[PDB]
Ligand binder design. Structure first.
Ligand SMILES: NC(=O)c1ccc[n+]([C@@H]2O[C@H](COP(=O)([O-])OP(=O)(O)OC[C@H]3O[C@@H](n4cnc5c(N)ncnc54)[C@H](O)[C@@H]3O)[C@@H](O)[C@H]2O)c1
Ligand SMILES: NC(=O)c1ccc[n+]([C@@H]2O[C@H](COP(=O)([O-])OP(=O)(O)OC[C@H]3O[C@@H](n4cnc5c(N)ncnc54)[C@H](O)[C@@H]3O)[C@@H](O)[C@H]2O)c1
Ligand SMILES: O=C(O)[C@@H]1CCCCN1
Ligand SMILES: O=C(O)[C@@H]1CCCCN1
Lengths: 355, 346
């Protein structure tokens, strides 16, 4: 009837090809630009924040969560990221803590049209979001980045931030000695000099900090409440379980705090520690009217990052566009579309080879 | 390492390898056993499902349906209800897929079609309820709505009851016209008949319509047989019902998922205290249904992810039997877990 629909699958080999072909820096800039425009759209009321996401707490081996994150563009498509936070992963299985995929469904028919790896895309859009926030809230001559947690997100935090700020040094800490010791290797491609530094030194020297740890519920802060530079900006990225926090309450209460997604942040971000009156205007507001950020670069600021599906949808479109140009991915007929729409058993087998 | 994907050609090859009747029976058996586990408190009903409403071209909804087995895997069905699909697009109303993820690590280990699977487990669920609640000598099936679910309703029921004929109705003439062809494989003779006649003559009815919210009922309260059992299958949007209230109030009603049915099924029209035991309890203790076969009964079917997990497991086993499917490395598992740009050869 209509032309046969199939699901366009970009797995790990194609996603690697997009990175090699576009270039890491260009790909990240594309994501930054698309996020910036989309957040400003939300800030103008032209689009909406994603609905709250849902999830299943897992107790074992270590407390974790598996979430589904929908975003609908009415009449167009529905994006659904499915993603696990499993922080025993790298230590028990050799896997990323964050493992997921992103799928797109036609909003008109419901058909699954595309499916791709969520691991790299997640890391990219999360670094991008910190870059968006830091352009607005970090001093534009920031030279020193601090990183607490030097696992996966840390790599793209450094990368994104190195594209928007004149970073000269990264001072880095992880409670796992092997993970902080390998960071420099992982960070080499950015050109930014790396030094292992304890949290107190990070707090004392950084212009900009990103916290992105797997700290357990009840076990923060990961950055001690000591001396910070007056203009410090922090991207508080770590987040999973209710009860999981990274920053000291005291520090938050001296900061201009902006959430990506306030309803979410107030339940599972750093803002879970705060009453709502202690939040400034949300990131989308700042994107749409950057004058709202006036004077905030020069005093303490916190971006409370939690992640939401709109970010995944935008990043996925960047990937799909680049994959379309470069002829990447496979086409798989996953859904059964019977030749008679009213007959579940109108099934077509694999054609016979020509003998 | 990789994701095992079973597509449209592979599910065709499953049905051929197993046989339509046998595959249905396999699903009926797994569902019976699984429901009984729930009825004994050994497994739990899936959590309430989520959804996004869609207004164009006609009202529908797209839903996500999770089921966790703590420690093995998480099943997620993603499924649309888009009742203009057949007439506008030549696509099924119900269009979905079912994915399996490892509970421990979160990885995506399998992905398959949800269209056949949904039709089969939904037929199966009615067969489960009907074996308990229809007269065992039922010979006449009634169908209101003769779209895709009606096919597997007839099929599954034909396997647990000695059906000789089906009396059928659809508000779309072209859809009631084609039913006999879609049903012919079962050997059950088909006759088109108005809803009042189906109500008077059927031993067992399944309602599975894409009726709009507030436009029920699809079966009139016009006189029924004493022993009638109804599988009330249709549902999607809150405010959608198929049965007349007067009939529900006189019935022994069992729900697949009571909490869900009270919100989205026929049990929307009832209070919790009026329901009989849930279907899981009846499967755990069939003796609890004694005598209900001979009086008016309704199974309020809404669909829940546990049924999809169980059906998916049947497909996976059959496909493993025959090395069916492809394996695709979708997820980027960097050898270096801490490097999202560690991609990936050689
Ligand atoms: N958009 C978002 O805001 C977003 C997106 C992706 C991930 N995340 C979250 O960011 C966090 C990090 O993810 P990841 O992929 O980098 O995980 P990872 O497991 O790759 O890295 C986490 C690092 O934190 C270290 N760590 C644990 N406790 C610490 C402490 N007290 N101080 C310093 N280091 C500590 C671990 O040793 C590990 O190396 C998680 O909480 C995750 O859910 C958020
Ligand atoms: N487990 C469950 O209970 C479960 C599972 C799958 C589908 N469903 C539901 O079953 C319903 C049918 O799904 P389908 O896949 O067969 O859809 P379909 O579109 O193939 O068939 C529905 C049929 O209903 C007919 N119809 C509409 N209004 C009617 C009326 N007032 N009287 C008689 N016929 C009418 C249509 O003309 C169409 O032929 C949907 O609501 C769907 O969401 C339930
Ligand atoms: O938005 C994200 O992708 C992450 C997934 C893990 C939990 C928190 N946020
Ligand atoms: O359980 C199911 O698959 C169907 C999906 C559509 C809404 C009604 N229930």
């Amino acid at each position: 009837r209509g032309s046969h629909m199939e699901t366009w699958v970009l797995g790990r080999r194609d996603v690697a090809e997009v990175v090699a072909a576009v270039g890491r820096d260009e790909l990240m800039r594309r994501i930054i630009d698309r996020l910036t425009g989309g957040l400003a759209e939300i800030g103008r009321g032209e689009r909406h924040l994603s609905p709250l996401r849902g999830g299943l707490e897992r107790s074992e081996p270590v407390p974790g969560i598996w979430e589904w994150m929908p975003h609908r563009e009415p009449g167009d498509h529905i994006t659904l990221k499915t993603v696990g936070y499993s922080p025993a992963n790298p230590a028990r299985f050799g896997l990323p803590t964050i493992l997921g995929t992103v799928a797109r469904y036609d909003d008109t028919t419901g058909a699954l049209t595309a499916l791709m790896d969520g691991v790299l895309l997640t890391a990219l859009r999360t670094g991008a979001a910190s870059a968006v926030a830091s352009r607005l809230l970090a001093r534009p001559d920031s030279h020193t980045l601090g990183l607490i947690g030097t696992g996966a997100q840390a790599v793209t935090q450094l990368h994104a931030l190195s594209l928007v700020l004149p970073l000269q040094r990264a001072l880095v800490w992880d409670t796992d000695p092997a993970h902080r010791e390998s960071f420099a290797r992982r960070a080499a491609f950015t050109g930014v000099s790396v030094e292992i530094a304890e949290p107190a030194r990070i707090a004392a020297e950084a212009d900009v900090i990103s916290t992105a740890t797997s700290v357990a519920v009840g076990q923060g802060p990961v950055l001690p409440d000591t001396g910070v530079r007056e203009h410090l900006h922090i991207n508080a990225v770590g987040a999973d379980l209710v009860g999981k926090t990274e920053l000291p309450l005291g520090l938050l209460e001296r900061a201009f705090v902006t959430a990506d997604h306030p309803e979410q942040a107030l339940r599972e971000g750093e803002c879970q520690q705060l009453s709502a009156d202690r939040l400034g205007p949300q990131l989308a507001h700042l994107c749409a009217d950057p004058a709202a950020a006036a004077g905030r670069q020069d005093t303490l600021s916190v971006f409370d990052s939690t992640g939401f599906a709109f970010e995944d949808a935008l990043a996925m479109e960047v990937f799909l566009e680049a994959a379309a140009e470069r002829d990447l991915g496979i086409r798989v007929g996953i859904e059964h579309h019977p030749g008679d729409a009213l007959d579940p058993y109108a099934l077509q087998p694999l054609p016979l080879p020509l003998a």
